[PDB]
Automatic annotation (TrEMBL), chain A:
Residues 5-196 form the RNA polymerase Rpb2 domain. This is DNA-directed RNA polymerase subunit beta. It comes from the Eukaryota. The chain holds residues 274 to 469 of 1251 of the full protein. RNA-dependent RNA polymerase that catalyzes the extension of a non-coding RNA (ncRNA) at the 3'-end using the four ribonucleoside triphosphates as substrates. An internal ncRNA sequence near the 3'-end serves as a template in a single-round Pol II-mediated RNA polymerization reaction. May decrease the stability of ncRNAs that repress Pol II-mediated gene transcription. DNA-dependent RNA polymerase catalyzes the transcription of DNA into RNA using the four ribonucleoside triphosphates as substrates. It is found in: Nucleus. It comes from Sus scrofa.
From TrEMBL, chain B:
Signal peptide: none annotated. It is found in: Nucleus. This is DNA-directed RNA polymerase subunit beta. It comes from the Eukaryota.
Automatic annotation (TrEMBL), chain E:
This is DNA-directed RNA polymerases I, II, and III subunit RPABC1. It is found in: Nucleus. The keyword Nucleus applies. HAMAP family: RNApol_Rpo5_RPB5.
Automatic annotation (TrEMBL), chain H:
It is found in: Chromosome; Cytoplasm; Nucleus. The chain holds residues 1155 to 1442 of 1970 of the full protein. This is DNA-directed RNA polymerase subunit. DNA-dependent RNA polymerase catalyzes the transcription of DNA into RNA using the four ribonucleoside triphosphates as substrates. RNA-dependent RNA polymerase that catalyzes the extension of a non-coding RNA (ncRNA) at the 3'-end using the four ribonucleoside triphosphates as substrates. An internal ncRNA sequence near the 3'-end serves as a template in a single-round Pol II-mediated RNA polymerization reaction. May decrease the stability of ncRNAs that repress Pol II-mediated gene transcription. It comes from Sus scrofa. The gene is POLR2A. Belongs to the RNA polymerase beta' chain family.
Length: 196, 147, 117, 97, 209, 48, 144, 272
């Protein structure tokens, strides 16, 4: 039986949906009883305005497993213990001498400047989950559980795997930015290097 | 690659892909990838020398198998990812002699083009002289002939 | 003109945002987490190249000369090192590939020069 | 009829579907009756005109006598009667048929 | 623009004249097709707050026979027409003794006024047309065949000859742009003459529903 | 299934199942499609 | 009945002798293929040096694609015509095509002269690999 | 070409080369190296204070190629922007002195990103030329006589005049038909619902007949006119377009057994 290759980042174009370019990674750790859990890193298209008098740029948003709402990328990066915008931009864009990519990621960075703490970021992660939280308590733990054992199991499931997961998520966002720029071509669903 | 042409540490099935345009190098060890053996072209010379054929004709005597040729660093398995970053020679009698040069930078050589076909498309005499729908229909009928 | 980069704070290392000075009529970069100010360098705070006239040679890297699947030529020597052999390839990018422009990369080691024909 | 046709067919083509293949029927009549068209004919052109008019009366799609049915009959066999006049006219029956 | 406005007003005037003539009214021959320069000379060549403004060219036409009924056409000043604007036209009509009238709206009518138009149908009939509807006489289009309104006597003759009822005729919408062009009400058979490539001419009938 | 009841009645008209006239005569001329041929109108395409 | 029973006396066949043209026709076919191939190559070298000018209405890549498809279609038609002038009136492919019973001129051209351009979704073979159709070709190879 | 430009939907994005926003509090000492500011220097248009007091501006540079192809001028674009934005915006253009076509836009008197928001709202839907709901339009000379203008000469002989015809990619009648130098008689369409909104039902019957004959006889096949006429008459014997689905067949009074014989079976019987 054919299947899409697991643990590999792909950039596709849902030309009919509200997303310009959508990234995905059907992450599945080898020798793990749990099945694969696909995480999507999408960019809201709305090429012009975001149907507002203030929403100028496109905002990158992530579809995490067991979470029903479109979580922003910066929220997840803050929830991983990276509070500074400079550090997140280091993990996303590896060169600070190409202002065009930084300008493209600027609207997504400026969506979530309200949330600055890891506690608030994790609380927003726990909001609108497949299993909704009770209060501030038992919802911080559920969000921590989701970020620990649901998204990206192939980069590791452990307490010290926060930075490795942050690096791989930054790679997913960076590849999405490259696809949005065209510096790397889009990925084919029928290329047999993308199948198992 | 030097370790894969010797089977020191890395298994022959494992594949390395160096993305050169974008600075990446990915090594795949998954279970499910689909590969096929290809000759290795060092210089515009094949590594399949005459001595390999001499030791390969006398099987059941020298115990020189296909796995020994894989261990000799002559053939290796190339999967679909690695085919995007390989210069594949079709046949050696045409694509290693000097001419008005096409690329002169071959890395692998196809063993024989007839091995691109399946089991039922291999029983067709002169399948390239036919039309492709006819080959497909014969492939359907070949699994139905009495015998 | 030119592109505009993201300014960064010095204390909390967040993004600085443009704002006006009601007194001196100058632009100041101000943080939103803390209260830190910087004098602006240019009036251009936002830019948008829509015709997309990009310098493709910047996106070209020298290591692509090691690709065996790229075609080589001994017809065009390198301008810097004078090496007669160089690889040539297309743009390999979107917002492009409407014109078939060749980009040459010299394959000589430790030079890595690229240019456009 | 020429003006009516040019109103009906703005595009300059006349390949139209009609029931009776009149040219073939004229040819069949020639072959059956052994015309030998070198000799002068012996049919009165007024017989041709009256026969065509009587035939157009005999070809009925719509029955009745009230003018609404008369207009329906005229419109039903307008194109065919135009073709019938064109093919079975006096000049062609006297010269080329 | 000002020349564009006078061209648009002249085209609307020409389409209204052709509509009245095809409806069966008294349309003067030179008024039926006048030059744009003639319109500019007669009205002023400046619709932008000038001589050829609206309400100056309200065309009053009578019927070819029974010259009593008239539908003196209306041209509102405002783009979006309302009830308090059409009540002035209702006052002008009740000042007269005629029940039909046409208004040429610039933008869309407010739906409350759309209901108000129906709210006086038995008393006096009001039709409305947008600017884009009257910038082209659709009856001149090659896709539109010859629509002719039939009298009641002809409808009775048709139904008696074909021995069928009004329920059995192929029908046509009351909101049909051609039906609106002729302003036919419900239950009014329209004969349609169109050329056919298999019979020459074909006359169909469309009862209004 | 849209037109499985549209037939020619005995007054040579075309009516559906509910006696609604689709065409007053079949094919706008009342002629069946088997006994017709392509013919040339000689009156059309001459010079005056 | 009667035509079949005359066909018994006459007999009708088809074979490998009906699919082979004389060496002069083969030389004409190969010369046409070589000329068209060189024409495509020189069009390619014009496109690389930005000496190709875009047709009004589309991009430069499509002016190139239109030129290449036009040249290859002209080669296919010319080779087909030059192939179907050498049947010698006894070729059974011509016997079936002229009668219209089975086949057409395109089948004769493809059997004898040249198969022609292969298409996927109305255009040429796409770059399934990274900027090449098959791993045997160099990258960015827009040749025939 | 003029009609082609007057029909195609031309936004500001398709014409602009690049754009940027600046902060130039003193227009006299403009930071963007332009002396054309002589206008503002001697302009009696409200100087600043409650006017050009807005120091931030929108500097957008057009290309000469698309301004030449669309047959546009700087004044026309400025007038369209002023009409679409009222007196809240100020636009200063550039004369034909250099290839650099400059439009400088200021706010006349949320804070600073509102100019960027209206920049997006100006690149999107300014509608400089043509109508909406239409993409690039292609024009050509016909070859088949169906589109060639067939005229009748004074000696009665037909003649095929090969005149330019347009062919759009969107659809909007009763608005293209309103344009000048456009034949309002022979201008047909490809969509049927749009004709039904414009030209009625019988014209839709003719249009459906022509389109059906086109899609049938494109590959050289022939289908008699009786069948085409019957299908186009059954779909238009109700006044409106009777789509051949459940949504159009099962909305006419034919019979519960007839309507349940189609795809929806139980629901029709339950409603009956
Ligand atoms: Zn700060
Ligand atoms: Zn060099």
């Amino acid at each position: 039986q054919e299947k899409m290759a697991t643990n590999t980042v792909y950039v596709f174009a849902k030309k009919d949906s509200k997303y310009a370019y959508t990234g995905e990674c059907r992450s599945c750790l080898e020798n793990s009883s749990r099945p694969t859990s696909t995480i999507w890193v999408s960019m809201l298209a709305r090429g012009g305005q975001g149907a507002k008098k203030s929403a100028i740029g496109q905002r990158i948003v992530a579809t995490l497993p067991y979470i029903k709402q479109e979580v922003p990328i910066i929220i997840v990066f803050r929830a991983l213990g990276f509070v500074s915008d400079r550090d997140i931009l280091e993990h996303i864009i590896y060169d600070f001498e190409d202002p065009e990519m930084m300008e493209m990621v600027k609207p997504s960075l400026d969506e979530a400047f309200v949330i600055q703490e890891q506690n608030v970021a994790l609380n927003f992660i726990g909001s609108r989950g497949a299993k909704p939280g009770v209060t501030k308590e038992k919802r911080i733990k559920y969000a921590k559980e989701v970020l620990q054992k649901e998204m990206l199991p192939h980069v590791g499931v452990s307490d010290f795997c926060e930075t490795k997961k942050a690096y791989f998520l930054g790679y997913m966002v960076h590849r999405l930015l490259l696809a949005a720029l065209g510096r790397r071509e889009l990925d084919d669903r029928d290329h047999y290097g993308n199948k198992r | 690659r030097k370790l894969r042409r010797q089977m020191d540490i890395i298994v022959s099935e494992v594949s390395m892909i160096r993305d050169i345009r974008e600075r990446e190098i990915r090594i795949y060890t998954d279970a499910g990838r689909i590969c096929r053996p290809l000759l290795i072209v060092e210089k515009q010379k094949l590594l399949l020398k005459k001595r390999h054929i001499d030791q390969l004709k006398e099987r059941e005597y020298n115990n020189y198998s296909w796995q020994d040729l894989v261990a000799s660093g002559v053939v290796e398995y190339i999967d679909t990812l690695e085919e995007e970053t390989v210069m594949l020679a079709m046949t050696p009698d045409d694509l290693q002699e000097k001419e008005v040069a096409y690329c002169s930078t071959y890395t692998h050589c196809e063993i024989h083009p007839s091995m691109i076909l399946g089991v039922c498309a291999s029983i067709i005499p002169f399948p390239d002289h036919n039309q492709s729908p006819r080959n497909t229909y014969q492939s359907a009928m070949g699994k139905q002939a009495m015998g | 003109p030119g592109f505009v980069g993201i300014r960064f704070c010095q204390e909390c290392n967040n993004m600085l945002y443009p704002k006006e000075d009601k007194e001196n009529r100058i632009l100041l970069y101000a943080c939103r987490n803390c209260d830190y100010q910087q004098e602006a360098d240019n009036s251009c705070i936002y830019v948008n190249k829509i015709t997309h006239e990009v310098d493709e040679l910047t996106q070209i890297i020298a290591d692509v000369s090691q690709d065996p699947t790229l075609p080589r030529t001994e017809d065009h020597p390198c301008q810097k090192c004078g090496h007669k052999e160089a690889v040539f390839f297309q743009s390999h990018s979107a917002r492009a590939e409407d014109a078939m422009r060749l980009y040459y990369v010299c394959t000589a080691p430790h030079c890595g020069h690229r240019w456009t024909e | 009829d020429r003006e009516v046709l040019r109103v009906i067919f703005p595009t300059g083509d006349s390949k139209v579907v009609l029931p009776c293949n009149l040219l073939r029927m004229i040819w069949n009549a020639q072959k059956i009756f052994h015309i030998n068209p070198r000799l002068p004919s012996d049919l009165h052109p007024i017989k041709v005109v009256e026969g065509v008019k009587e035939l157009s009366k005999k070809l009925v799609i719509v029955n009745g006598d009230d003018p609404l049915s008369r207009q329906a009959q005229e419109n039903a066999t307008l194109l065919f009667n135009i073709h019938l006049r064109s093919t079975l006219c006096s000049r062609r029956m006297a010269e080329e048929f | 623009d000002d020349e564009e406005e006078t061209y648009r007003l002249w085209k609307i005037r020409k389409t209204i004249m052709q509509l009245c003539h095809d409806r069966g009214y008294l349309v003067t021959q030179d008024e039926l097709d006048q030059t744009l320069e003639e319109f500019k000379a007669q009205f002023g060549d400046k619709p932008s707050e000038g001589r050829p403004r609206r309400t100056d060219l309200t065309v009053l036409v009578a019927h070819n026979d029974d010259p009593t009924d008239q539908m003196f056409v209306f041209f509102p000043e405002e783009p979006k027409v309302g009830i308090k604007t059409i009540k002035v036209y209702c006052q002008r009509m009740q000042e007269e003794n005629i029940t039909r009238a046409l208004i040429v709206v610039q933008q869309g009518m407010t739906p409350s006024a759309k209901q108000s138009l129906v709210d006086m149908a038995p008393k006096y009939i009001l039709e409305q047309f947008l600017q884009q509807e009257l910038l082209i006489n659709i009856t001149e289009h090659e896709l539109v065949p010859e629509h002719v309104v039939m009298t009641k006597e002809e409808v009775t003759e048709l139904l008696a000859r074909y021995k069928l009822r009004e329920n059995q005729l192929p029908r046509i919408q009351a909101g049909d742009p051609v039906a609106r062009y002729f302003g036919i009400k419900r239950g009014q058979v329209v004969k349609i003459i169109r050329p056919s490539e298999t019979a020459g001419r074909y006359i169909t009938y469309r009862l209004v529903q | 299934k849209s037109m499985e009841s549209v037939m020619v009645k005995y007054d040579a008209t075309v009516r559906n199942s509910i006696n609604q006239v689709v065409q007053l005569r079949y094919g706008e001329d009342g002629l069946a499609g088997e006994s017709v041929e392509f013919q040339n109108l000689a009156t059309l395409k001459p010079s005056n | 009945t009667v035509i079949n029973n005359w066909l018994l006396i006459e007999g009708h066949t088809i074979g490998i002798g009906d699919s082979i043209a004389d060496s002069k026709t083969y030389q004409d076919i190969q010369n046409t293929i070589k000329k068209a191939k060189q024409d495509v190559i020189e069009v390619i070298e014009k496109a690389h040096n930005n000496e190709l000018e875009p047709t009004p209405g589309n991009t430069l890549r499509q002016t190139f694609e239109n030129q290449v498809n036009r040249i290859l279609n002209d080669a296919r038609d010319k080779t087909g015509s030059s192939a179907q002038k050498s049947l010698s009136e006894y070729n059974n492919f011509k016997s079936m095509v002229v009668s219209g019973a089975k086949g057409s001129k395109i089948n004769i051209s493809q059997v004898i002269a040249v198969v022609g351009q292969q298409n996927v979704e109305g255009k040429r073979i796409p770059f399934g690999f990274k900027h090449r159709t098959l791993p045997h070709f160099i990258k960015d190879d827009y040749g025939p | 070409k003029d009609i082609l430009c007057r029909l195609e939907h031309t936004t500001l994005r398709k014409v602009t080369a690049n754009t940027a926003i600046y902060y130039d509090p003193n227009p006299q000492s403009t930071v963007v190296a332009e002396d054309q500011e002589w206008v503002n220097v001697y302009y009696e248009m409200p100087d600043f204070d409650v006017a050009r007091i807005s120091p931030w501006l929108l500097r957008v540079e057009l290309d000469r190629k698309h301004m030449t192809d669309r047959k546009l001028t700087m004044e026309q674009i400025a007038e369209k922007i002023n009409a679409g934005f009222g007196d809240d915006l100020n636009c200063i253009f550039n004369d034909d002195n250099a290839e650099k076509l400059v439009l400088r836009i200021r706010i006349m008197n949320d804070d600073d990103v509102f100019l960027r928001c209206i920049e997006s709202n100006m690149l999107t839907d300014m509608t400089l030329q043509g109508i909406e709901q239409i993409s690039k339009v292609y024009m050509h000379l016909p070859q088949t006589d169906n589109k060639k203008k067939i005229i009748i000469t004074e000696d009665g002989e037909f003649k095929a005049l090969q005149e330019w015809i347009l062919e759009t990619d969107g659809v909007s009648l009763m608005r293209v038909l309103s344009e000048k130098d456009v034949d309002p008689v022979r201008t047909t369409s490809n969509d049927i619902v749009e004709i039904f909104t414009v030209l009625g039902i019988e014209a839709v019957r003719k249009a459906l007949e022509r389109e059906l004959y086109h899609v049938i006889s494109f590959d050289g096949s022939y289908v008699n006119y009786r069948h085409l006429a019957l299908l186009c008459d059954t779909m238009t014997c109700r006044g409106h377009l009777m789509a051949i689905t459940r949504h159009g067949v099962n909305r006419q009074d034919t019979g519960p057994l007839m309507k349940c014989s189609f795809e929806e079976t139980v629901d029709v019987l339950m409603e009956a």
